[PDB]
Coordinates of C-alpha atoms and ligand atoms in Angstrom, one line a residue:
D1 CA 72.2 80.3 90.0
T2 CA 75.0 84.2 92.5
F3 CA 74.5 85.4 94.9
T4 CA 76.3 88.9 96.2
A5 CA 79.5 88.7 98.4
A6 CA 80.2 91.1 100.7
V7 CA 83.6 92.0 102.4
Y8 CA 84.3 94.8 105.6
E9 CA 87.9 96.2 106.1
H10 CA 88.0 97.3 109.2
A11 CA 90.1 100.5 111.2
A12 CA 89.5 99.2 114.8
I13 CA 89.7 100.8 117.9
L14 CA 92.2 99.3 119.4
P15 CA 93.1 98.4 123.7
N16 CA 94.3 101.2 125.5
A17 CA 97.4 98.2 126.4
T18 CA 98.7 96.8 128.8
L19 CA 100.4 96.5 132.2
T20 CA 97.4 95.0 134.0
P21 CA 94.5 92.4 132.0
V22 CA 91.5 94.3 132.2
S23 CA 87.9 93.5 133.8
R24 CA 85.8 91.9 131.8
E25 CA 83.5 95.2 131.6
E26 CA 86.2 96.8 130.0
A27 CA 87.0 94.1 128.0
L28 CA 83.5 93.9 127.1
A29 CA 83.0 97.5 127.0
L30 CA 86.1 97.5 123.7
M31 CA 84.8 94.8 122.8
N32 CA 81.0 96.8 121.3
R33 CA 83.1 100.2 120.4
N34 CA 84.6 97.6 117.4
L35 CA 80.6 96.1 117.0
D36 CA 79.2 99.5 117.0
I37 CA 81.5 100.0 114.0
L38 CA 81.3 96.0 112.6
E39 CA 76.8 96.7 113.0
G40 CA 77.6 99.7 110.3
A41 CA 78.9 97.3 108.2
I42 CA 76.9 94.3 108.3
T43 CA 73.2 96.1 107.7
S44 CA 74.7 97.8 105.2
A45 CA 76.1 94.9 103.4
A46 CA 72.6 93.8 103.9
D47 CA 70.2 96.6 102.7
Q48 CA 72.7 96.7 99.6
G49 CA 71.1 92.6 98.9
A50 CA 75.1 91.0 100.6
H51 CA 74.4 87.1 101.7
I52 CA 77.3 86.8 103.5
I53 CA 79.7 89.2 105.0
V54 CA 83.3 88.0 105.9
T55 CA 84.9 90.7 108.8
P56 CA 88.9 91.1 109.2
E57 CA 90.6 89.1 111.8
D58 CA 90.7 90.5 115.9
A59 CA 88.8 93.6 114.7
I60 CA 86.9 93.4 118.0
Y61 CA 90.1 93.3 120.3
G62 CA 93.1 93.9 118.4
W63 CA 96.4 91.5 118.2
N64 CA 98.4 93.2 121.2
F65 CA 98.2 90.5 123.9
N66 CA 100.0 87.6 125.9
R67 CA 98.0 84.8 127.5
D68 CA 96.6 87.1 130.7
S69 CA 95.5 90.0 128.7
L70 CA 93.3 88.7 126.6
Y71 CA 91.8 86.1 129.1
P72 CA 88.6 89.1 129.5
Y73 CA 87.6 89.2 126.3
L74 CA 87.5 85.5 126.2
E75 CA 83.8 83.7 125.4
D76 CA 83.6 79.6 125.3
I77 CA 82.1 79.4 122.1
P78 CA 80.3 76.0 122.3
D79 CA 81.0 72.7 119.4
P80 CA 78.4 73.9 116.3
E81 CA 76.4 70.5 116.5
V82 CA 75.0 72.0 119.9
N83 CA 72.0 73.5 117.7
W84 CA 72.7 76.9 118.5
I85 CA 70.6 80.3 118.1
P86 CA 72.7 82.5 120.5
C87 CA 69.9 85.6 119.6
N88 CA 67.5 83.1 120.8
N89 CA 68.2 81.5 123.2
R90 CA 70.8 84.0 125.7
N91 CA 72.0 82.2 128.5
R92 CA 71.9 78.6 127.4
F93 CA 75.7 78.6 127.7
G94 CA 75.9 81.4 130.3
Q95 CA 77.8 84.7 129.5
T96 CA 78.3 84.8 126.1
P97 CA 77.8 88.5 125.0
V98 CA 79.8 88.6 122.0
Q99 CA 78.6 85.5 120.4
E100 CA 74.2 86.4 120.9
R101 CA 75.7 90.4 119.2
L102 CA 76.8 88.5 116.3
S103 CA 73.8 86.3 116.3
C104 CA 71.3 89.5 116.1
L105 CA 73.2 91.1 113.4
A106 CA 73.0 88.1 111.0
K107 CA 69.1 86.9 112.3
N108 CA 67.8 90.7 111.7
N109 CA 69.5 91.5 108.7
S110 CA 68.7 88.2 107.3
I111 CA 71.8 87.7 106.1
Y112 CA 75.6 85.1 107.2
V113 CA 78.0 87.0 109.5
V114 CA 81.5 85.7 109.4
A115 CA 83.8 87.2 112.7
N116 CA 86.7 86.8 113.9
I117 CA 86.6 86.8 118.1
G118 CA 88.8 84.3 121.2
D119 CA 88.0 81.6 122.5
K120 CA 88.7 80.4 126.0
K121 CA 88.6 76.5 126.9
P122 CA 88.3 75.0 130.3
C123 CA 90.9 72.0 130.7
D124 CA 91.8 70.1 133.8
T125 CA 95.5 69.0 134.6
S126 CA 94.6 64.9 134.1
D127 CA 95.4 65.8 130.1
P128 CA 98.7 66.9 129.4
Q129 CA 98.4 68.8 126.2
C130 CA 96.7 71.1 128.6
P131 CA 97.9 74.4 129.2
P132 CA 100.1 75.8 133.0
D133 CA 97.2 78.4 132.9
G134 CA 94.3 75.8 133.1
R135 CA 93.1 76.8 130.1
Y136 CA 93.3 77.0 126.0
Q137 CA 93.0 79.9 124.8
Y138 CA 91.8 79.8 120.7
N139 CA 92.1 82.2 117.6
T140 CA 88.9 82.0 116.9
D141 CA 86.1 82.4 113.9
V142 CA 82.7 82.4 114.2
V143 CA 80.1 81.6 111.5
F144 CA 76.6 82.3 111.7
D145 CA 73.9 81.9 109.7
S146 CA 70.3 84.1 108.7
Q147 CA 68.5 83.3 110.8
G148 CA 71.5 83.5 113.4
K149 CA 72.4 80.2 113.9
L150 CA 75.7 79.1 115.2
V151 CA 77.1 77.0 111.8
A152 CA 80.6 77.3 112.3
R153 CA 83.7 77.1 114.2
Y154 CA 87.2 77.6 113.5
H155 CA 90.5 77.3 115.1
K156 CA 93.7 79.5 114.1
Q157 CA 95.5 75.9 113.5
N158 CA 98.5 78.5 112.1
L159 CA 100.1 81.1 114.4
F160 CA 102.1 84.0 113.3
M161 CA 105.4 85.2 114.5
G162 CA 104.3 86.9 118.8
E163 CA 100.8 84.8 118.6
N164 CA 101.5 83.3 121.9
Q165 CA 98.5 84.5 123.8
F166 CA 97.3 81.8 121.4
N167 CA 97.5 78.2 121.5
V168 CA 97.3 75.4 118.7
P169 CA 94.5 72.5 118.2
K170 CA 95.8 68.8 118.3
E171 CA 93.9 68.6 115.4
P172 CA 94.1 70.5 111.7
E173 CA 90.4 71.8 112.3
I174 CA 88.3 71.4 108.7
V175 CA 85.9 73.2 108.4
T176 CA 82.4 73.4 106.0
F177 CA 79.5 74.7 106.2
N178 CA 76.5 74.9 103.8
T179 CA 74.5 77.0 102.2
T180 CA 71.9 77.7 99.6
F181 CA 74.6 79.6 97.7
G182 CA 77.6 77.3 97.2
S183 CA 79.6 74.9 100.0
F184 CA 81.6 77.1 102.1
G185 CA 85.7 76.6 104.0
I186 CA 87.7 79.2 105.7
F187 CA 91.0 80.1 107.4
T188 CA 92.1 82.3 108.7
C189 CA 95.7 85.0 107.7
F190 CA 98.8 83.3 107.5
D191 CA 96.6 79.5 107.4
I192 CA 97.0 80.0 103.5
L193 CA 100.1 80.0 103.1
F194 CA 100.1 76.2 105.0
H195 CA 99.0 73.2 103.3
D196 CA 96.1 72.8 106.6
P197 CA 93.4 72.9 107.1
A198 CA 94.0 75.8 103.6
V199 CA 94.2 73.3 100.6
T200 CA 92.5 70.3 102.4
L201 CA 89.7 72.5 102.4
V202 CA 89.5 72.8 97.6
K203 CA 90.9 69.5 97.2
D204 CA 89.0 67.0 99.4
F205 CA 86.8 68.8 100.7
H206 CA 85.9 70.9 97.3
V207 CA 84.6 73.9 98.2
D208 CA 83.1 76.6 96.0
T209 CA 84.1 79.4 98.5
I210 CA 86.4 80.5 101.4
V211 CA 85.4 83.3 103.6
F212 CA 88.8 84.5 104.7
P213 CA 88.8 86.8 108.2
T214 CA 93.8 88.8 107.7
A215 CA 94.6 91.2 109.3
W216 CA 97.8 90.7 107.1
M217 CA 101.1 93.2 107.0
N218 CA 101.5 93.0 102.8
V219 CA 105.1 93.2 101.7
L220 CA 106.1 93.3 98.0
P221 CA 106.9 91.9 95.5
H222 CA 104.8 88.4 96.0
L223 CA 103.1 89.0 99.5
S224 CA 100.9 91.9 99.5
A225 CA 97.0 90.9 100.4
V226 CA 94.9 91.9 97.3
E227 CA 97.3 90.4 95.5
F228 CA 99.0 87.4 96.9
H229 CA 94.7 86.5 97.8
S230 CA 93.9 86.5 95.0
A231 CA 96.4 85.2 93.4
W232 CA 95.7 81.7 95.5
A233 CA 91.9 82.3 95.2
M234 CA 93.2 81.8 90.9
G235 CA 95.3 79.3 91.3
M236 CA 93.4 77.0 93.4
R237 CA 90.4 78.1 91.2
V238 CA 87.8 78.4 94.3
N239 CA 86.0 82.1 95.1
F240 CA 88.0 83.8 98.6
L241 CA 86.5 86.5 100.6
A242 CA 89.1 87.9 102.2
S243 CA 88.3 90.7 104.5
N244 CA 91.3 92.7 106.3
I245 CA 92.0 94.7 108.9
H246 CA 92.6 98.9 108.4
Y247 CA 95.9 99.8 109.6
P248 CA 98.2 101.5 107.8
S249 CA 100.9 102.3 110.1
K250 CA 101.5 98.6 110.3
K251 CA 101.1 98.1 105.9
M252 CA 97.5 96.7 106.8
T253 CA 95.0 97.1 103.6
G254 CA 93.6 94.8 101.4
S255 CA 90.8 93.8 101.1
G256 CA 88.5 92.1 98.1
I257 CA 86.4 89.5 96.3
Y258 CA 88.0 87.3 93.9
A259 CA 86.4 84.7 91.7
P260 CA 88.9 81.9 89.9
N261 CA 89.3 83.8 86.9
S262 CA 89.9 86.7 88.6
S263 CA 90.0 89.2 90.9
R264 CA 85.5 91.1 91.0
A265 CA 86.4 94.0 93.3
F266 CA 88.7 94.9 95.8
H267 CA 90.6 97.8 98.6
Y268 CA 93.7 99.6 98.4
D269 CA 94.4 102.5 100.5
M270 CA 97.8 103.6 102.6
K271 CA 96.2 107.1 103.3
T272 CA 93.4 107.6 105.3
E273 CA 92.5 106.2 109.0
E274 CA 88.5 105.0 106.9
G275 CA 87.1 101.3 106.9
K276 CA 85.3 100.5 103.7
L277 CA 82.5 98.1 102.8
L278 CA 83.0 95.8 98.9
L279 CA 79.9 94.0 97.6
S280 CA 80.0 92.1 93.9
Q281 CA 78.1 89.1 92.2
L282 CA 80.1 85.9 92.9
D283 CA 79.5 82.2 91.3
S284 CA 77.9 80.0 94.0
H285 CA 78.8 77.1 91.9
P286 CA 81.8 77.9 90.0
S287 CA 83.8 75.8 88.0
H288 CA 87.2 74.2 89.6
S289 CA 88.1 72.2 86.2
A290 CA 90.5 74.1 84.7
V291 CA 93.0 72.0 85.3
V292 CA 97.0 73.1 85.6
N293 CA 100.0 71.4 85.6
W294 CA 102.5 73.9 86.5
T295 CA 106.2 72.2 84.8
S296 CA 104.8 71.6 81.7
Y297 CA 106.0 74.0 79.3
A298 CA 108.7 75.2 80.5
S299 CA 110.4 71.3 81.3
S300 CA 109.9 70.8 77.7
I301 CA 111.5 73.6 76.1
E302 CA 115.2 74.7 75.9
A303 CA 116.5 77.7 77.5
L304 CA 115.6 81.1 76.0
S305 CA 119.2 82.8 76.9
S306 CA 122.1 81.4 77.1
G307 CA 125.7 83.9 78.8
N308 CA 124.5 86.3 80.6
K309 CA 125.4 88.3 84.0
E310 CA 123.4 86.9 86.5
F311 CA 123.5 88.3 90.1
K312 CA 121.4 87.1 93.4
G313 CA 119.4 89.9 94.9
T314 CA 117.3 89.9 98.2
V315 CA 113.4 89.5 97.9
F316 CA 111.7 89.0 101.4
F317 CA 115.2 88.1 103.2
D318 CA 115.7 85.1 100.1
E319 CA 119.0 85.0 97.8
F320 CA 117.0 84.9 94.2
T321 CA 119.5 84.0 91.3
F322 CA 118.6 87.6 88.4
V323 CA 118.7 88.1 85.1
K324 CA 118.6 92.0 84.5
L325 CA 116.0 92.6 80.9
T326 CA 117.9 94.3 78.3
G327 CA 115.8 95.5 75.4
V328 CA 112.5 97.3 75.4
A329 CA 112.0 92.8 74.2
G330 CA 113.7 89.6 75.4
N331 CA 113.1 86.3 75.5
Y332 CA 115.1 84.7 79.4
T333 CA 115.7 81.8 81.0
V334 CA 117.7 81.8 84.7
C335 CA 117.8 78.7 87.2
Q336 CA 118.4 78.4 91.0
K337 CA 119.0 74.8 92.1
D338 CA 115.5 72.8 90.5
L339 CA 113.7 76.1 89.1
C340 CA 114.5 77.5 85.6
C341 CA 112.6 80.2 85.1
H342 CA 111.4 81.4 81.3
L343 CA 110.0 84.9 80.6
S344 CA 108.8 86.0 77.0
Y345 CA 108.4 89.7 76.9
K346 CA 107.3 93.2 74.9
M347 CA 107.5 96.4 77.1
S348 CA 105.1 99.3 75.7
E349 CA 107.7 101.4 75.6
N350 CA 111.7 101.3 76.9
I351 CA 110.5 104.7 79.9
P352 CA 114.7 105.4 81.3
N353 CA 115.8 105.2 84.9
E354 CA 114.0 101.8 85.1
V355 CA 115.6 98.5 85.5
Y356 CA 113.5 94.6 84.9
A357 CA 115.6 91.8 86.5
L358 CA 113.7 87.9 86.0
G359 CA 114.6 85.9 89.3
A360 CA 113.9 82.6 90.1
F361 CA 114.2 80.9 93.5
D362 CA 113.9 77.5 95.3
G363 CA 114.2 76.9 98.8
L364 CA 113.1 77.3 102.5
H365 CA 111.7 81.0 103.7
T366 CA 113.5 81.3 107.7
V367 CA 112.3 84.2 108.8
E368 CA 109.3 85.5 110.3
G369 CA 108.2 81.8 108.9
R370 CA 109.5 79.0 108.0
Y371 CA 108.1 77.5 103.8
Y372 CA 109.3 76.1 100.7
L373 CA 109.6 78.2 98.1
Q374 CA 109.9 77.8 94.3
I375 CA 109.8 81.0 92.5
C376 CA 109.4 83.0 89.1
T377 CA 109.2 86.6 89.2
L378 CA 109.1 89.6 86.5
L379 CA 110.2 92.5 88.9
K380 CA 110.5 96.2 88.9
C381 CA 113.6 96.5 90.6
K382 CA 113.0 99.5 93.3
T383 CA 116.4 101.6 91.5
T384 CA 118.7 102.2 88.3
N385 CA 120.8 99.6 90.7
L386 CA 120.9 96.3 90.3
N387 CA 121.0 95.3 94.2
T388 CA 117.5 97.3 94.6
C389 CA 115.8 94.4 92.2
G390 CA 113.3 92.2 95.3
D391 CA 113.7 95.4 97.6
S392 CA 109.1 97.0 97.5
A393 CA 109.1 98.6 94.6
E394 CA 105.1 100.8 94.7
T395 CA 106.1 102.3 91.9
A396 CA 106.3 101.5 88.0
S397 CA 106.0 103.4 85.0
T398 CA 106.5 100.8 82.3
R399 CA 102.8 99.1 81.3
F400 CA 103.6 95.8 79.1
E401 CA 102.2 95.2 75.9
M402 CA 102.9 91.7 76.4
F403 CA 104.1 88.1 79.1
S404 CA 105.0 84.4 79.2
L405 CA 106.3 83.3 81.7
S406 CA 106.8 80.1 83.5
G407 CA 109.3 77.5 85.6
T408 CA 109.9 74.2 85.7
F409 CA 107.4 73.9 88.7
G410 CA 108.5 70.6 91.8
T411 CA 105.1 71.0 93.0
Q412 CA 100.9 71.4 91.9
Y413 CA 99.7 74.8 93.4
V414 CA 101.4 77.3 92.0
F415 CA 99.3 80.9 92.5
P416 CA 99.9 83.3 89.5
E417 CA 100.2 87.2 90.5
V418 CA 100.2 90.1 88.5
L419 CA 100.6 93.5 89.9
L420 CA 100.4 97.0 88.7
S421 CA 101.4 100.4 89.9
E422 CA 100.2 101.2 92.9
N423 CA 99.6 98.2 93.9
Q424 CA 96.8 97.4 91.7
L425 CA 95.4 94.1 90.6
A426 CA 94.6 93.8 86.8
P427 CA 91.9 91.8 86.0
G428 CA 90.6 89.9 83.4
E429 CA 94.4 90.9 81.7
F430 CA 95.8 88.0 82.0
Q431 CA 95.3 84.0 82.0
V432 CA 96.8 81.0 83.0
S433 CA 97.3 78.0 80.5
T434 CA 96.8 74.3 80.6
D435 CA 101.1 73.7 79.6
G436 CA 101.5 76.6 83.3
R437 CA 102.1 79.2 81.4
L438 CA 100.7 83.3 83.2
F439 CA 100.2 85.5 80.0
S440 CA 98.8 88.5 79.3
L441 CA 95.3 88.8 77.6
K442 CA 95.7 92.5 76.6
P443 CA 98.3 95.2 77.2
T444 CA 98.5 95.8 80.8
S445 CA 95.6 98.7 81.9
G446 CA 98.7 100.1 84.5
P447 CA 102.2 99.7 84.9
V448 CA 103.3 96.7 85.7
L449 CA 104.9 96.3 88.9
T450 CA 105.1 92.3 88.8
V451 CA 104.3 88.9 87.8
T452 CA 105.2 86.1 89.2
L453 CA 104.0 82.1 89.9
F454 CA 104.4 82.0 93.8
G455 CA 104.8 77.7 94.3
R456 CA 105.1 76.1 97.8
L457 CA 106.2 73.0 98.2
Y458 CA 104.3 71.9 101.4
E459 CA 106.3 69.0 102.0
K460 CA 110.1 71.0 102.3
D461 CA 108.3 72.1 104.8
Ligands
LIG501 C1 75.8 70.8 100.3 O1 75.2 71.5 99.9 C2 74.3 71.5 98.6 C3 72.6 72.3 97.8 O2 71.5 71.9 98.8 C4 74.8 69.7 98.0 O3 73.8 69.3 96.8 C5 72.7 68.3 96.2 O4 72.5 67.7 96.6 C6 71.8 66.9 96.1 C7 72.0 65.7 96.3 O5 73.2 64.7 95.3 C8 71.7 66.8 94.9 O6 69.8 66.9 94.3 C9 70.2 65.8 92.8 O7 69.9 66.5 91.7 C10 70.1 65.4 90.7 C11 70.0 66.6 89.8 O8 71.2 67.4 89.2 C12 71.1 69.0 89.2 O9 70.2 69.4 88.7 C13 70.1 70.5 89.3 C14 68.9 71.2 88.6 O10 68.8 71.3 87.3 C15 71.6 70.7 89.3 O11 71.0 72.1 90.8 C16 72.8 70.7 90.0 O12 73.2 70.8 90.1 C17 75.0 71.1 89.5 O13 75.5 70.1 89.0 C18 76.1 70.7 87.9 C19 77.2 69.0 87.4 O14 75.4 68.0 86.9 C20 77.3 70.9 88.3 O15 78.2 71.9 86.9 C21 76.9 72.3 89.0 O16 78.0 73.0 89.3 C22 76.0 72.1 90.2 O17 75.8 71.4 90.9 C23 72.3 68.7 89.5 O18 72.8 69.0 87.7 C24 69.1 64.8 90.9 O19 69.1 63.8 89.5 C25 68.3 64.1 92.1 O20 68.2 63.0 92.2 C26 67.1 63.0 92.4 O21 67.6 62.2 93.9 C27 66.6 62.3 95.4 C28 66.9 62.5 96.7 O22 68.6 63.0 96.6 C29 65.2 62.3 94.8 O23 64.8 63.0 95.7 C30 64.8 61.8 93.2 O24 63.7 60.7 92.9 C31 66.0 61.8 92.8 O25 66.1 60.3 92.1 C32 68.6 64.4 92.8 O26 67.8 65.3 93.5 C33 71.5 68.9 93.6 O27 72.1 68.8 92.3 C34 73.0 69.3 94.6 N1 73.3 70.2 94.4 C35 73.9 71.0 94.3 C36 74.0 72.4 93.5 O28 75.6 70.7 94.1 C37 75.3 68.9 98.5 O29 74.7 67.7 99.5 C38 75.2 69.2 100.0 N2 76.9 68.6 101.1 C39 77.5 68.6 101.7 C40 78.5 68.2 102.2 O30 76.2 68.5 102.4
LIG502 C1 103.4 67.2 84.6 O1 103.9 66.9 83.0 C2 105.0 66.6 83.2 C3 105.3 67.0 81.9 O2 105.2 65.3 81.3 C4 104.6 65.4 83.6 O3 106.1 64.5 84.3 C5 106.3 63.8 83.5 O4 106.1 62.4 84.0 C6 106.8 61.2 83.5 C7 106.0 60.0 83.9 O5 104.0 60.5 83.9 C8 108.2 61.3 83.4 O6 108.5 60.2 82.5 C9 109.8 59.6 83.3 O7 110.6 60.0 82.9 C10 111.9 58.7 83.6 C11 113.5 59.7 83.7 O8 113.5 60.2 82.1 C12 114.1 61.6 83.3 O9 113.1 63.1 83.9 C13 114.1 64.1 83.2 C14 113.0 64.6 84.4 O10 113.3 64.4 85.5 C15 113.3 64.0 82.2 O11 114.0 65.4 81.4 C16 113.8 63.0 80.8 O12 112.6 62.6 80.4 C17 114.8 61.8 81.4 O13 114.9 61.8 80.9 C18 112.2 57.9 83.4 O14 112.5 56.2 84.5 C19 110.0 57.0 83.6 O15 110.4 56.2 82.5 C20 109.6 55.2 82.0 O16 110.3 54.1 82.7 C21 108.6 52.4 82.3 C22 109.7 51.7 83.6 O17 110.3 51.3 83.9 C23 109.0 52.1 81.4 O18 107.1 51.8 81.2 C24 107.9 53.6 80.5 O19 106.8 53.2 79.4 C25 108.7 55.0 80.6 O20 110.1 54.6 80.0 C26 109.3 58.2 82.5 O21 109.8 58.7 81.4 C27 108.5 62.7 83.2 O22 110.9 62.4 83.7 C28 108.3 63.8 83.9 N1 108.8 65.0 83.5 C29 109.1 66.0 84.7 C30 110.5 67.5 84.0 O23 109.3 66.1 86.0 C31 104.2 65.7 84.9 O24 104.2 64.1 86.2 C32 102.8 66.2 84.9 N2 101.9 66.0 86.8 C33 100.9 65.7 87.1 C34 100.6 66.5 88.3 O25 100.2 65.4 86.4
9TC503 O1 98.9 85.7 111.2 C1 99.1 87.0 110.4 C2 100.5 87.6 109.1 C3 100.7 87.0 108.7 N1 101.5 86.9 107.0 C4 101.7 88.5 107.2 N2 102.3 88.9 106.0 C5 103.1 87.8 105.1 C6 104.0 87.8 106.1 C7 104.8 86.3 105.9 N3 105.4 85.1 106.4 C8 106.5 86.6 107.1 C9 106.2 88.1 107.4 N4 104.9 88.0 106.8 N5 100.7 89.3 107.7 C10 99.8 89.2 108.6 N6 98.6 87.6 110.9 C11 98.5 87.2 112.5 C12 97.9 88.4 113.5 C13 99.5 89.3 113.4 C14 98.7 90.9 113.6 C15 100.2 91.6 113.9 O2 100.6 91.3 114.5 C16 101.4 90.3 115.0 C17 100.2 89.2 114.3 C18 99.8 89.2 111.7
NAG504 C1 67.5 92.2 117.2 O1 66.2 92.0 117.1 C2 65.7 92.2 118.8 C3 64.7 92.3 118.4 O2 63.8 91.8 117.5 C4 66.3 92.8 119.9 O3 65.9 92.0 120.4 C5 68.2 92.7 119.3 O4 68.6 93.5 120.0 C6 68.7 93.5 118.0 N1 69.7 92.7 117.5 C7 70.3 93.6 117.2 C8 71.5 93.5 116.8 O5 70.4 93.9 115.8
NAG505 C1 111.0 86.1 71.6 O1 110.2 84.7 71.1 C2 109.6 84.7 70.5 C3 108.5 83.5 70.0 O2 109.5 82.4 69.6 C4 110.2 85.7 69.1 O3 108.5 85.6 67.9 C5 110.9 86.9 69.9 O4 110.8 87.9 68.3 C6 111.9 87.0 70.4 N1 112.2 87.8 70.7 C7 113.7 88.1 71.4 C8 113.6 89.6 70.9 O5 114.1 87.1 71.4
NA506 NA1 100.9 88.8 122.0

């Protein structure tokens, strides 16, 4: 059993913004301008045989808001248990034109539609957690099935910097929907860096596939959307449908269809202002049983290199301990606190004016989000000056004939990333061993930007 998956990268029409909140008529007009574009992708995906389509986070109204400017865009989204086809019973829950339009899009195209809209929940001064506003406002994913029925409603648990227009639910929402093409879980953007509900869906609810609306801002070398989202899919052994906003000026680009063994389709484009529809087949019930012990090999072996010139280098505001790679081939070990990283490599050639380093990081990230990390990275330094190792490098010339990366990870949640020049994924050029080694299966098809083992220590957050 296989199915055809679809994701759409969306160049959104953002509201003029801001000063005074718009009328419900003006908010609806804007939302319908974005929905007209999404209708275009949904109908094409359905005409091309897709079983499900994911659209991005904030694709219908953007991200520039305060609590009051957002309010006119909001709908009261009922509990999916209510058993409702908004297309077949338009006024069951009052004025809900966005829900009705999404339901009709799913129903008329006989396709599952995943979209991200806004939920309004009015509350009384009686409950202590009710905002002084008189309502809760949630960043919400909605899922409509092939018949137009509301089958999932998910309120974003992990809010990003400046998402003050939204509230956090009391308890993390573990939202799943079952189909004839596998069990599905759902979360949004920043949720991918946290345990709840992301890890819970996979390890406890045993989902086959994650549907993921996102408005991701690319942060090289480790947090580029295609790179990190496919790594997370591989580390969690799940299918992953990443639908991202298309906005190059904010570094937003990177949608794909990821399988547990490799990426199946991906899109990165910083040049045009156009959206993109991606389609690809996936196994409905992929194997989830390919277990990895991430510290195994690394904890067994002794330091590959001795007495070396180690330097501190900044990677996304985090101070890594690096060791420059010297020679077209080598074996290095670098440690930072509780983490020891090992690399075995062989380059295709010793390209001039291009420096590579092996970095180690064990610590808490605090800039624009608080999360505990353990990272082992083989990265292309921006220039030849070692104080540029860890800075965003979009191009490289060095192809690798072989690599083997591993670390003494104090966690079972490690995401294996392989990124080529210029933000290209490498499918299926690498694998992960049961021992915890990220290794090449072939010489890389393009020059290497990074080979990273990105680990999360959720308990140390
Ligand atoms: C979400 O929806 C899914 C899909 O509907 C639900 O999963 C289904 O659950 C049913 C109830 O437990 C399962 O039915 C039983 O199936 C076995 C036969 O084994 C299966 O053979 C199938 C055909 O060859 C195959 O599709 C199926 O799935 C596969 O399982 C293997 C491991 O074995 C795995 O590798 C694959 O990834 C895939 O999962 C099995 O191989 C029957 O023996 C069994 O007996 C009957 O009980 C009936 C009463 O329930 C009775 O009518 C009858 O007389 C027998 O006594 C059931 O028919 C079904 O296999 C399973 N399907 C899948 C794809 O998982 C899932 O439960 C839902 N989840 C939630 C949370 O709601
Ligand atoms: C993934 O793979 C790793 C590697 O195998 C697993 O980690 C190992 O788990 C072992 C338990 O199954 C640990 O063994 C214990 O070690 C204790 C202390 O040993 C020191 O630990 C360092 C690492 O921190 C090692 O280098 C050295 O071995 C040190 O000496 C011992 O106290 C403990 O002893 C037991 O005592 C009882 C009696 O009370 C005896 O009956 C028993 O036979 C045994 O002697 C035990 O040996 C091992 O340290 C640990 N290694 C590391 C590096 O963490 C992971 O747990 C696997 N992960 C998953 C999720 O499966
Ligand atoms: O959740 C996110 C979001 C989360 N992470 C990233 N990039 C990785 C990363 C991780 N930690 C720190 C910094 N960067 N990009 C976007 N967004 C939600 C909507 C949103 C629209 C742009 O303006 C702001 C708010 C971004
Ligand atoms: C769906 O079809 C019904 C009639 O079959 C129509 O009323 C509705 O406007 C359609 N909606 C969309 C978005 O295609
Ligand atoms: C690196 O280690 C491997 C395996 O032990 C070995 O075959 C290779 O020759 C080593 N290379 C260097 C330059 O140390
Ligand atoms: Na805001």
